């Protein structure tokens, strides 16, 4: 009767979990007023690809931005006099993911080679050369993200994701569960722990220390392929296929708000959050963007101006300004 | 002015940079892709006729394709093979390459690359004809046991599943010994493809 | 493993011409532009003329206009100056430097061994000639410009370079606060508008020299007259 105790744990959590929640974000954050009118202009346009754009990753200063392309390169941007620092071209086009090291010295790239390419910015010789190529992953490559100058966390198609020491090149430990795809995935503040969203529905909780699953949070009907950490580290947002947007919370182990629209039935690309975590900007299968009050669940704008589907995201460390990567070839920076 | 120095030559090596782009896209751009379906994905590049040609194969990957069919958007065709002894082993596996090609030919983002079909195992099919009929592959067929007229129902039932009949061509051949046949075949559908884009990116047609 | 290695130097006359070569291995010489840099026998640092990636843009010092000719050959990876109708002044060592621009990099990072020829603006001033120092003792030097080097971007375009007795001359500082790889955290830069100046802390033995600032504002770039170190 190992089902049958499975259903009844099941049905334990959810009983825990109906009787932790007593209210909601709707009606105790009612009486607050709302960010009003988001009118948020481009600033920069950055027209140097030739290929649909897959994607793309702020630095630490906030200054320099890497981008990766299907015609088999990674471009570094200076954001701010719009210059190419760097292009590396890559051995295989089909790249879908890229990472900045925080600190600087390092970019990373992977896709349907089911290898993880690190390549080193700062050499003697001048040029950039592939630094190690980590494989091990019996499927293509969704997400990854520098956990350290020597850790990478690597998140893969074949239902696992991995973290592993650069300089050894194995896998230290090797995070399993999923049942479906593994999208992608965000490291938390303190780098303690990580979240990753999967094509069965369900975004997971993992201690990267201990190499185990915390939480387990179903709410989405349907594949997830963007997720986000809250600035505080005690929440994260999912995008799905469902066009809609889920805040979760780790500390409640439930589902805290839904952001959805009955003009909205597009899939959603991407999600990632303001400094403050007062917006939620989700990029969709449409070709503009959308700005959500977070705190309100209500459309505070849209980013209108790109001919094709927006495919990645991101926000800089200091809410400056947000890079929009989209299958149209520009990237476009928003103030 | 308002540039410094070492500013100018910043901008001087970011222009040397988009000059070595536009070169490297314009020689990318002078290629053909194809997507061929039956660690990773597997390339091939072979020259015929002054046209470079750059065939991908996507066996292997156990995953499932919906989340990465999008990739190959844009090639110039569709290359699917289909073996005409199939007919009969089951592990009824000619109705599963039916389904497939039906949903290749069906798929939202190919509802403009053409389709060239390939039929092998034509030596074997032909033997073959003369132990199982082609009763036990289609309840409904009336015919005789000509591998010959076989064939040709075989090819029209491949061939009636494209909905999409404008805007996409579904351009049919049989293997045979000469390769350069099959390639100058090919070569013929890419460039018939080409010829229709072009025409169709420019004001008439 | 970087190396520049110049030859084509010796005894002229006047009114003869020289061919002076540099041959560089070990890194991409076709992602550097190019600097000459000649010191008198007994005096300071004086740039000569600069070639940038792909020929594109070329300069000469004023002295040197219509007489000197730089140029490069990138797959033979060689950089080469023609200097015609020489005079008695032009007696010096010439240095082949190495020098990348883009965001966040180092300028003048490697030098040339050095290469002995004989024949027979903005003012950046040193401070003192010489000073004498002992080991375990911090150490400052300072020298100041006849124009604010301060850029509307925010950056103070001073360099710094230590010329070792029987050496090529080697950066220490670039931008005035930023700190050469593999130079000790003891070196610090620090100024302010036209006054700028370079602390040494924990002197030990091997920062016996000559200390030289530049500035980069300016193509005619400018040498200071070098303090010396006992």
């Known amino acids: 009767q190992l089902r049958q105790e499975a259903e009844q744990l099941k049905n334990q959590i959810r009983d825990a979990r109906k009787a932790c929640a007593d209210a909601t974000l709707s009606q105790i954050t009612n009486n607050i007023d709302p960010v009003g009118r988001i009118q948020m202009r481009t600033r920069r346009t950055l027209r140097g690809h030739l290929a649909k754009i897959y994607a793309m990753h702020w630095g630490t200063d906030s200054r320099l931005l890497v981008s990766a392309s299907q015609d088999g390169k990674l471009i570094i941007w200076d954001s701010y006099t719009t210059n190419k620092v760097h292009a590396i071209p890559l051995r295989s086009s089909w790249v879908m993911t890229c990472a900045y090291a925080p600190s600087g010295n390092y970019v990373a790239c992977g896709g349907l080679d089911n290898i993880c390419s690190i390549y080193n910015l700062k050499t003697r010789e001048g040029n950039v050369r592939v630094s190690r190529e980590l494989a091990g992953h019996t499927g293509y490559l969704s997400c990854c993200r520098f956990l350290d100058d020597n850790q990478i966390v690597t998140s893969s198609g074949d239902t696992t994701c991995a973290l592993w020491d650069i300089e050894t090149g194995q896998q230290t430990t090797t995070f399993t569960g999923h049942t479906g795809d593994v999208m992608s995935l965000s490291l938390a503040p303190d780098t303690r722990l990580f979240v990753s969203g999967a094509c069965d529905a369900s975004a997971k909780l993992w201690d990267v220390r201990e190499g185990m699953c915390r939480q387990t949070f179903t709410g989405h009907e349907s594949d997830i392929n963007a997720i986000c950490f809250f600035p505080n580290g005690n929440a994260f947002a999912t995008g799905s296929d469902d066009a809609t947007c889920r805040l979760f919370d780790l500390r409640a182990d439930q589902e805290l708000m839904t952001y959805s629209h009955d003009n909205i039935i597009c899939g959603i690309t991407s999600v990632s959050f303001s400094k403050s975590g007062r917006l939620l900007l989700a990029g969709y299968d449409d070709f503009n963007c959308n700005v959500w009050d977070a705190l309100k669940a209500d459309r505070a704008g849209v980013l209108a101006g790109h001919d094709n589907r927006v495919s990645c995201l991101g926000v800089t460390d200091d809410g400056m300004a947000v890079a929009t990567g989209s299958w149209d070839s520009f990237l476009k920076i928003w103030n | 002015c308002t540039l410094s120095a070492e500013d100018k030559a910043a901008v001087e090596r970011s222009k040397m940079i988009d000059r070595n782009l536009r070169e490297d896209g314009e020689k990318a751009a002078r290629e053909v892709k194809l997507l061929l379906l039956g660690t990773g994905i597997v390339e091939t590049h072979f020259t015929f006729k002054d046209l470079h040609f750059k065939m991908f194969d996507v066996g292997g990957q156990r995953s499932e394709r919906k989340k990465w069919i999008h990739c190959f958007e844009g090639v110039t065709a569709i290359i699917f093979c289909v073996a005409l002894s199939d007919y009969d082993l089951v592990l009824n596996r000619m109705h599963e390459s039916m389904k497939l090609f039906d949903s290749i030919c069906n798929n939202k983002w190919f509802t403009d690359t053409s389709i060239i079909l390939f039929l092998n195992k034509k030596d074997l099919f032909e033997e073959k004809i003369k132990k199982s009929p082609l009763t036990i592959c289609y309840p409904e067929y009336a015919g005789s046991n000509t591998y010959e007229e076989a064939a040709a129902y075989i090819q029209c039932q491949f061939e009636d599943l494209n909905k999409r009949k404008d805007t996409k061509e579904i351009y049919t051949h049989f293997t045979c010994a000469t390769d350069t046949k099959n390639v100058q075949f090919v070569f013929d559908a890419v460039t018939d493809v080409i010829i229709k884009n072009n025409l169709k990116d420019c004001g008439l047609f | 493993d970087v190396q520049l290695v110049e030859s084509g130097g010796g005894l002229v006359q006047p009114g003869g011409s020289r061919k002076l070569s540099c041959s560089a291995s070990?890194?991409?010489?076709?992602?550097?532009?190019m600097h000459w840099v000649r010191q008198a026998p007994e005096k300071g640092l004086e740039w000569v003329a600069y070639i940038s990636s792909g020929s594109g843009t070329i300069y000469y010092a004023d002295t040197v206009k219509g007489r000197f000719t730089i140029s490069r050959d990138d797959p033979k990876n060689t950089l080469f100056l023609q200097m015609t109708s020489l005079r008695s002044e032009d007696t010096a060592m010439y240095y082949c430097?190495?020098?990348?621009?883009?965001?966040?990099?180092?300028?003048?990072?490697?030098w040339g061994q050095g290469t002995t020829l004989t024949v027979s603006d903005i003012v950046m001033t040193q401070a003192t000639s010489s000073v004498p120092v002992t080991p375990g003792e911090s150490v400052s030097i300072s020298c100041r410009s006849s124009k604010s080097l301060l850029h509307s971007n925010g950056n103070t375009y001073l360099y710094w370079f230590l010329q070792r007795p029987g050496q090529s001359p080697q950066l220490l500082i670039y931008?005035?606060?930023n700190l050469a790889s593999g130079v000790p955290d003891r070196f610090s830069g620090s100024g302010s508008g036209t006054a700028f100046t370079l602390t040494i802390s924990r002197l030990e033995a091997e920062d016996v020299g000559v200390y030289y600032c530049?500035?980069?504002?300016?193509?005619?770039?400018?040498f200071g007259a070098g303090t010396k170190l006992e």
């Open positions: 070990g890194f991409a010489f076709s992602s550097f532009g």
């Open positions: 931008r005035m606060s």
């Open positions: 530049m500035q980069h504002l300016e193509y005619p770039l400018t």
């Open positions: 430097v190495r020098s990348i621009y883009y965001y966040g990099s180092s300028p003048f990072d490697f």
